[PDB]
Every structure is written in structure tokens, then in C-alpha cells.
Amino acid sequence: HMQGSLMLDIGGTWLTAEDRQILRHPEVGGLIIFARNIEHPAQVRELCAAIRAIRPDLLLAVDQEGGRVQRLRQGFVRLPAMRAIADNPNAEELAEHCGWLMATEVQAVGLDLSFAPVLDLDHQDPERAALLAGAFIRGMHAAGMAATGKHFPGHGWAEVAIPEDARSLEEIRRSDLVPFARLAGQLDALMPAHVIYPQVDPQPAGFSRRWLQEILRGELKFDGVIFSDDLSMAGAHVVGDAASRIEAALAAGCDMGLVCNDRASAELALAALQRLKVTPPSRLQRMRGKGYANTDYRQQPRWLEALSALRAAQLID
Numbered sequence: 111h112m113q114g115s116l117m118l119d120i121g122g123t124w125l126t127a128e129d130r131q132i133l134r135h136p137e138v139g140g141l142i143i144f145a146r147n148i149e150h151p152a153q154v155r156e157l158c159a160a161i162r163a164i165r166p167d168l169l170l171a172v173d174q175e176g177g178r179v180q181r182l183r184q185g186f187v188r189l190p191a192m193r194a195i196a197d198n199p200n201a202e203e204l205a206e207h208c209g210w211l212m213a214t215e216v217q218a219v220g221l222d223l224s225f226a227p228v229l230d231l232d233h234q235d236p237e238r239a240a241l242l243a244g245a246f247i248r249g250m251h252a253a254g255m256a257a258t259g260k261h262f263p264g265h266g267w268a269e270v271a272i273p274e275d276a277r278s279l280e281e282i283r284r285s286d287l288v289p290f291a292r293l294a295g296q297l298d299a300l301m302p303a304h305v306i307y308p309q310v311d312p313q314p315a316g317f318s319r320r321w322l323q324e325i326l327r328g329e330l331k332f333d334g335v336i337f338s339d340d341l342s343m344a345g346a347h348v349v350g351d352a353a354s355r356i357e358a359a360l361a362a363g364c365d366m367g368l369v370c371n372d373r374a375s376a377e378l379a380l381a382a383l384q385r386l387k388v389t390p391p392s393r394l395q396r397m398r399g400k401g402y403a404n405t406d407y408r409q410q411p412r413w414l415e416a417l418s419a420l421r422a423a424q425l426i427d
């Protein structure tokens with residue numbers, strides 16, 4: 111009866127028979143790719159095509175995670191870092207161009223969305239930081255891509271258990287919350303922090319009805335997609351299982367559970383969704399990219415004009 115979906119990953123650069131089978135379950139709604147799955151844009155495009163032949167409705171995401179190493183031969187477009195963009199007189203335009211460039215290439219290789227490091231708002235003048243991230247978001251949207259931020263509500267220092275942050279809500283409100291409050295009406299999706307704020311709630315933000323429903327949906331009026339944090343944590347030696355955690359995440363109001371780097375865990379989370387007979391959240395297809403896969407994107411005028419602006423500003427070449 112209830113609503114939810116799973117986002118998972120694969121181990122390699124091409125699909126296994128096991129991947130093909132698990133992709134057919136309708137409770138699987140997403141796939142994310144990482145460096146280990148990427149050889150070059152051409153192989154990424156062909157991989158996305160193979161997945162869409164199984165499931166045209168999958169949301170396909172690439173995690174950029176602060177640069178993916180060595181896209182040297184026919185690689186992905188190299189974009190300036192946001193700190194370099196900020197120190198220009200036309201930083202807002204340049205951030206727009208960067209978001210449009212990244213989103214245009216990502217969808218040209220058949221993906222729906224990118225998890226971009228500039229939209230990690232708590233691991234980055236903060237009002238100017240919000241302004242430049244908003245401009246990056248306009249570029250992404252102009253290319254037809256939905257924009258994901260993290261980590262709500264914010265915690266960018268250190269902790270091997272799960273971090274706890276002892277600040278009041280009014281102290282969080284006047285600090286880490288401010289980027290989110292400002293981009294909430296512009297972001298299409300958010301990922302929560304793997305942090306407990308005991309002054310506010312005893313559960314991590316990603317399993318807290320109070321963080322997700324009362325502060326985020328209520329106070330911040332956010333109506334986009336809530337991704338869970340990583341419900342597998344493969345290698346961290348946690349106890350509990352991806353199956354109990356995805357139940358906990360959907361209970362709190364997550365739309366889609368992420369189970370990365372642990373196929374065993376993804377299968378347990380999937381069995382959990384099957385028993386629930388979940389159907390996809392009505393929100394979910396907001397993340398579908400309006401762009402399309404193609405190979406001529408680098409010869410288009412808007413692409414060459416975006417690069418010319420970056421170059422005039424001294425940022426590339």
C-alpha cells in the first residue's frame with residue numbers, strides 16, 4: 111500500500127545476468143554509477159542504453175564525488191571549481207554555464223542526473239555561496255536536469271560510530287540550515303546527513319519524522335524527493351541490515367532508499383520493499399531528465415558559447 115523505491119548499483123562497466131534480473135523488479139527505481147563503472151562517455155552512453163532497454167523508466171545517476179579520476183582520452187568535460195568561479199565579476203553567469211555544461215553532457219550519455227559536489231552545501235560568505243549554487247542550479251535546469259543537494263540539515267566537520275551533533279535547533283537554524291532554507295524552493299531533491307541531533311530528535315536525520323516531515327517538508331516547505339543516506343554502509347561493520355533501514359527510512363518519509371556497494375544488501379532491501387508491496391512515489395519521476403542521449407552535443411552552438419565564456423574568464427584552456 112505504502113510508497114517507496116530502491117536505488118542500487120552494479121559492480122562493473124557492463125551488465126551481468128544478475129544485474130539484468132534485479133533491474134526488472136518495479137520496486138527498483140534507480141541506479142547510480144561511480145568511477146568503477148565508467149570507462150569513457152561512449153561506454154557510459156552504451157551502458158545507459160542497455161539499462162533502458164530493460165527499464166526505460168529507471169532514474170540513472172552518476173555520483174561525481176569530487177572528481178572521478180582520469181577522464182583523459184575522450185573523457186568528460188573538465189569544469190572549474192566553484193571557488194575559482196566565485197572570484198569573477200560575472201560569477202553567476204559562469205556558475206550557470208558550468209551547471210548547464212555538466213548537465214548537458216551527463217544527459218548526452220543517457221543519464222538523468224548527477225550528484226554534483228557544488229551542491230554538497232555543508233561540505234563546501236555563505237549567502238554568496240547560496241547565490242552561486244542557485245545559479246549553478248539554473249544552468250542544470252536550463253539543460254533539463256533535476257538538482258540534488260546534501261547533506262540536510264548540515265554537519266561538515268568530523269565524528270567509529272555515527273556522529274552526534276549537540277547543537278540546539280535554533281543554533282542549527284542560524285547556521286547549517288541556512289543554505290537549505292534558501293535553496294529549498296529550487297532543489298528537486300535532498301539527501302540527509304548521517305548525524306543524530308539529540309537536542310532535536312534521537313534518530314539520524316534520514317530516519318527522523320521530525321527532521322524530514324516537520325522541519326524539511328513543513329518549515330522549509332520542501333516538496334521534492336528525499337533520498338535516504340547510504341543504507342548499506344558496506345565495510346563499516348554496522349549491525350542491522352539494509353532491509354530494516356529502508357523500512358525505517360520510508361517510515362520517516364524518504365522517497366527512495368540508496369543501497370550502494372553491497373549487492374547482498376540491495377537484495378535484502380528489495381525483498382523488504384516487495385513484502386510491503388510498495389508502489390513508486392508520485393514525486394519520483396520529477397527526477398527524470400528532459401535531455402536525451404546523443405553524440406553531437408559538443409558541436410552545438412550553446413555548448414561552444416558556454417566554453418567561450420569560461421575561457422574568457424580565464425577558467426579553462
Ligand SMILES: [Zn+2]
Pocket residue numbers: 230231232233260261266
Ligand atoms: Zn555534506
